[model samples]
Target: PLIVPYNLPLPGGVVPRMLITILGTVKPNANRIALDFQRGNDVAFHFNPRFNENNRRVIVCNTKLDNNWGREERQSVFPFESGKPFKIQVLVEPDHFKVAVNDAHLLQYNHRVKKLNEISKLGISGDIDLTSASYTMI
Candidate 1:
């Protein structure tokens, strides 16, 4: 009923005004986890949350092109805690992505790769219990 470390191909690719939803639980001892929107060899959007031993919690988002990672956006508005269920909604727009956690608006990342239609896959990895990953027209 649950799986981890998935990279599923998107049916029609990502389009404007669509909603991408991810539901899962963070492992109680998780140190890090990452969610990614992939375009072949490139990463269109990278969302990572870290729980460090220093008690430093951070949520990071960025892009990777041609095997090189772009500038990192380290966000302090961390909403997830270890051993808890969470819902993540990524509202896909023409120019940026609006990410919300548990129905609350979280952060936004502008498009580094303008061709959203070329984003072919969605990937998940690290310490998490993934329940579902789906998309819908919004």
Candidate 2:
């Protein structure tokens, strides 16, 4: 069980060519886990992995603006397993974000918000035990 909604401040915000990594373990009974890049109250990026939703496995990527969710991008090849440790890395690009899970390419999301530097916060929520999370500008 997680503490529910952990937040980390991004020093000097996220710039193009930056990378963010999260290392964690899924709980045995985990249902979902979510990671977000936030700009104030808006979510610039949302990465969610669902383990048991409607008995299906999926990874959903989206953005939220003014509290409204945009179109969702779903990945069918689930890479996370309950009770197993995992690593997720997100690379910031000029026009999109590239994500890799466990050292393998996973997905990419086009930028919904133009200014990457505005994304000053990293948020994590849901049923996983986080070992470490870090951000580095490249």
Candidate 3:
């Protein structure tokens, strides 16, 4: 059994130089998977990987505040595969966040919300079979 939209509270919230790791499997018919770092109703980071958007592969990074989505940053590389397991790690930095998938560096997203400690929760959604998610302070 898998939770479609999984929500978890960060133990001590996110600080600079922390790392969050997620283990999951992509559904066979996955259209997208979204991982969000949130503070209350504000989404500080929205990391989305789309498998079939416009029949093209892309990773979309953005933020949402006051119900408004920011400009999207789209990356062309698609390292995810449908029906396969994945390990994703997000490293929090002072100016940006670095992402790695399957032990390989993927992309870096600059801070949009400014305060890293404001990220108190983690939200996961879309076509994914989540196994485990955890975080460690650095």
Clashes of each: 0, 0, 0
lDDT of each: 0.88, 0.89, 0.89
Q: What TM-score would you give candidate 2 relative to the actual structure?
A: 0.94
- Please give, for residues 22-131, the per-residue lDDT of candidate 2 as tens digits: 88889898999999899989999999999977899999989999999999999998999999999999999888899999999999999988778889999998888988
Q: Any runs in candidate 1 off by more than 4 Å, and if so which?
A: none
Error of 2 at 130 (Å): 0.7
lDDT of 3 by residue, 1-138 (tens): 457698878866788778999999999989999999997798899999999898997999999999999999998888889999999999998888899999999999998888777788999898889998888887
Encode model 1's per-residue lDDT on 12-126: one tens digit a residue. 7888888988899988899998989998889999999988836789998999999999899988988988999999999998889899999999999999988888998999887
For model 1, the run of ten residues with the poorest summed lDDT: 1-10
Question: 1 or 3, which is superior by lDDT?
Answer: 3
- Lowest summed-lDDT stretch of 10 residues in model 2? 1-10
Pairs clashing within candidate 3: none
The global Cα lDDT (0 to 1) of model 1 is: 0.88
How close is every model to the real structure, measured as TM-score?
0.95, 0.94, 0.95
**By TM-score, how accurate is candidate 1?**
0.95
Question: Model 3: how far is 83 from its true place, Å?
Answer: 0.6
